[PDB]
Amino acid sequence: RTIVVTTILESPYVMYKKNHEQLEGNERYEGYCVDLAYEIAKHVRIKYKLSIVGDGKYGARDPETKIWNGMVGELVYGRADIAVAPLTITLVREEVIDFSKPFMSLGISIMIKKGTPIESAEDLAKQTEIAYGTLASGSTKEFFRRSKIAVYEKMWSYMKSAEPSVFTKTTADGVARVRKSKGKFAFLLESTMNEYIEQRKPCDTMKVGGNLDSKGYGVATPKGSALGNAVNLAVLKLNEQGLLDKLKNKWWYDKGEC
């Protein structure tokens, strides 16, 4: 009766509340996806427990082992009933899980330390002074790996062979690396995360240039799950009511710091 909602600690989607160590269950967490899960469960009429994905990954398939990890794996192997997270709708995932229509639109983007002389991916690719990387095990990395577009192929060739690694285990690690690198590291990550960090102290980063692609996050459910239809209608309803907009403003901009 209580459905398991897998998610991921990623600001400002899911974050520990100030005094989380004193709290239990869903009360431990707050953020955009916490509010979204709440609103969805209200419309779908279900009780639910939030579960931070053990491996802290979004979801990729190991090419030799064929096993899916991350939140995707939790749905594929039946350990979670739904994923409410900034989980990018991609072809390879759509082949193994279902997704609602997007609750958020976004694109890959470039984060720089303010003052870094970079305005575009083309700028990054043609030089080697400033290092650059992506999150490991996610859709941004796969974008570069899979691209057949010259600029992105070049970037991927550089990143894949870079030493030390330019692939971070979390978004937060990549941001920290941008902040501490005195302008010699730039981070490729989704515009949503980039825009959020731009609004937080110490206000030393910025998104530059246009997004590299155009895509969406969806609420995910096991292939053929009978929760799928209701979750999809719920997302559409929440969008048309203006609630998704309200939540984005709430967690990104209303308390912006920059």
Ligand X SMILES: N[C@@H](Cn1oc(=O)[nH]c1=O)C(=O)O
One residue of 4, 9, 11, 16 binding Zn ion per CB under 5 A: 16
**9 makes contact with Zn ion (CB under 5 A):** no
Q: How many CB atoms lie within 10 A of CB 141?
A: 20
Which residue, 99 or 251, has its beta carbon nearer to a copy of itself?
Answer: 99
Q: Is 6 assigned to a binding site?
A: no
Site string for a copy of itself, 15-44 (x = CB under 8 A): ------------------------------
Q: Please report how close the Cβ of residue 139 comes to ligand X at its closest, in angstroms.
A: 4
State how far the alpha carbon of 186 is from the alpha carbons of 105, 111, 144, 203, in Å.
22, 6, 15, 15
User: What tokens were used for 254?
Assistant: 């209303």
Q: Which does 101 bind (CB under 5 to 8 A by kind): ligand X, Zn ion, a copy of itself, none?
A: a copy of itself
Site string for ligand X, 196-235 (x = CB under 6 A): ----------------------------------------
Q: Please report how close the Cβ of residue 149 comes to a copy of itself at its closest, in angstroms.
A: 6
**159 makes contact with ligand X (CB under 6 A):** no
User: What tokens were used for 8?
Assistant: 């991921």
Which residue, 51 or 232, has its beta carbon nearer to a copy of itself?
Answer: 232
One residue of 13, 29, 48, 58 binding ligand X per CB under 6 A: 58
Residue least distant from ligand X (Cβ):
138
Which residue, 116 or 137, has its beta carbon nearer to ligand X?
Answer: 137
Q: Which residues lie near ligand X (CB under 6 A)?
A: 58, 86-88, 135, 138-141, 171, 189-190, 193
Which residues line the annotated binding site for L-glutamate?
A: 86, 88, 93, 139-140, 190
